[PDB]
């Protein structure tokens, strides 16, 4: 208690797998400029694997820059282009690899950075038709190229 201090936990590192997609369906990715206004460091915090829908600016001064889709604005809902599966470091790259056509589970689509991981986000399902995500099983399906 005074001259001898016992064991005490210092560090804790946990490590996960990646976000699994279907082999049978296909992958298609085109890299995009990251919108510098949104706080990107919030979207890549936790060690849990996630993926989040991304909408592109159609026009304006930042035409071409992509940002995480806000589920409140219809001009941010209609121009959705894809979803970043893996994870990324905005402190070293303003150019993320947005996936256009893949097949990701409902469990691993989190549109909010403080939404709990490994749990299906509900507002994505209640905006599944506007965002053109067809749900047939757990796994989502999206082809924003067609």
């Amino acid at each position: 208690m005074d001259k001898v201090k016992l064991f005490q936990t210092i560090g804790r590192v946990e490590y996960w797998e990646r976000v699994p997609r279907l082999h049978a369906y296909g992958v298609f990715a085109l890299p995009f400029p990251m919108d510098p206004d949104v706080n990107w460091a919030q979207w890549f915090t936790g060690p849990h694997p996630r993926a989040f829908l991304v909408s592109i600016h159609k026009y304006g001064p930042k035409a071409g820059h992509v940002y995480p889709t806000n589920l409140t604005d219809e001009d941010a809902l209609l121009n959705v282009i894809g979803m970043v599966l893996d994870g990324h470091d905005y402190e070293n790259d303003p150019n993320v690899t947005v996936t256009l056509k893949a097949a990701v589970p409902i469990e691993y689509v989190q549109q909010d950075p403080q939404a709990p991981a490994l749990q299906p986000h509900q507002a994505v399902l209640d905006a599944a038709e506007v965002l053109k995500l067809k749900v047939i099983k757990g796994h989502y399906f999206f082809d924003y190229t067609r």
Binding site: D2, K3, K5, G11, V13, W16, R18, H23, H139
Partner: protein
């Protein structure tokens, strides 16, 4: 420390110089002389604990230990079901984790001094003989040996204190602490004591006992099955312990089961002495705990002899009989062998001459640095189940012969 006396001259100089009082003339007489030694034979040193903590020594002060633990995701899961002719679906995601930990250890310090002024060094003669000034030379050697034993007593005291209470506690109310340095060095023994609400020598009604000791150690061994380090091996109990096995109900019933001595049919009734001459053996056979005995004593300030293992209590070792860590010294200061400071490790003892100064004096100083350490800890939890105490009975002194007083003459 003996009185500086010559026994032959002192024993010869008591006889009367003239002393004609009886018959008005000196009588004839015969005189035989004999001396006597007086000591307390029952104040024996606590030899137990030095058998259990060995002595290593590090020059560095602090010791720390880092433990890396690793939990990996085991191969869980079940293969998915589908109809033939379909596609395939991906698996979930798994998680492995890694933590660390940190130990800490830090020694103590000890030192004490003597002094001898000029009047003591110059004037010291024997009490009956008439000799030169050469007695304080023989007198300082006893103080040297007493400081050596006085340091061995603190080694054995710290190690006995950690075996007794788990923590070691120093406080200003203590007798040998003038400094008043409060200390609580909690070594983190998990469960130091074993619970007994009703003790073994607790009888209700008419000779019926309350609990069962052989069954108590049996279900300690049974309820420490899947903890393979809490499962006890040995007992070191000091005083008369066979009597507590010989007077309680259940162990008497086990001796009567073994020897077949049903009281109405086989034999009349066996004496209590025939019980206690085999109760420990049948106890050892039905449990397997090798019971050691350790019955050395210390004369405390009451003037009443007490054992080192207190009566009514027995210690329990929990994994094996062996070294429970070790007692480790650290380094102190020895001055400039070449030009630079070069240390030393064991308990030191320094003498100082000041016989040239005003007034001449002379001081000896000894002391050391060190603290006990518990080496083997648990890995997955941070527990330490190696020794435990339990108080088994309350009235054990009545089973013991009395002790003599200390002769103060």
């Amino acid at each position: 420390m003996r009185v500086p006396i010559n026994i032959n001259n002192a024993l010869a100089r008591v006889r009367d110089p003239l002393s004609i009082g009886g018959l008005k003339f000196p009588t004839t007489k015969e005189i035989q002389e004999a001396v006597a030694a007086i000591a307390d034979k029952f104040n024996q040193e606590n030899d137990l604990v030095d058998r259990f903590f060995p002595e290593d020594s590090t020059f560095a002060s602090e010791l720390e230990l880092y433990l890396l633990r690793t939990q990996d995701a085991e191969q869980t899961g079940m293969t998915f079901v589908h109809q033939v002719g379909s596609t395939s679906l991906p698996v979930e995601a798994r998680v492995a984790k890694v933590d660390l930990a940190k130990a800490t250890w830090s020694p103590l310090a000890f030192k004490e001094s003597r002094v001898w002024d000029e009047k003591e060094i110059l004037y010291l003669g024997r009490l009956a003989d008439e000799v030169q000034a050469g007695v304080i030379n023989e007198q300082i050697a006893e103080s040297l040996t007493w400081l050596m034993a006085r340091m061995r007593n603190r080694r054995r005291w710290l190690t006995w204190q950690v075996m007794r209470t788990g923590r070691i506690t120093i406080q200003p109310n203590d007798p040998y602490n003038p400094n008043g340095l409060k200390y609580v060095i909690d070594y983190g023994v998990t469960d130091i004591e074993l619970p007994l609400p009703q003790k073994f020598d607790a009888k209700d009604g008419n000779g019926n006992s309350a609990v069962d000791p052989i069954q108590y150690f049996r279900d300690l061994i049974k309820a420490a099955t899947y903890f393979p380090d809490r499962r006890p091996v040995a007992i070191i109990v000091g005083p008369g312990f066979d009597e507590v096995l010989a007077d309680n109900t259940f162990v008497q019933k086990y001796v009567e089961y073994e020897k077949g001595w049903v009281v109405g049919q086989n034999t009349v009734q066996p004496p209590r002495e025939v019980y206690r001459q085999a109760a420990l053996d049948i106890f050892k056979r039905y449990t397997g705990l090798e019971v050691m005995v350790y019955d050395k004593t210390y004369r405390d300030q009451d003037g009443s002899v007490k054992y080192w293992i207190p009566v009514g209590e027995l210690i329990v070792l929990n994994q094996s009989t062996g070294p429970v860590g070790r007692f480790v010294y650290t380094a102190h200061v020895a001055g400039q062998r070449n030009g630079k400071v070069v240390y030393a490790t064991g308990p030191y003892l320094t003498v100082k001459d000041h016989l040239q100064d005003d007034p001449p004096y002379y001081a000896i100083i000894a002391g050391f640095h060190g603290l006990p350490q518990l080496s083997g800890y648990n890995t997955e939890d941070f527990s330490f189940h190696r020794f435990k105490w339990l108080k088994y009975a309350n009235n054990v002194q009545s089973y013991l012969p009395p002790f003599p007083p200390k002769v103060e003459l």
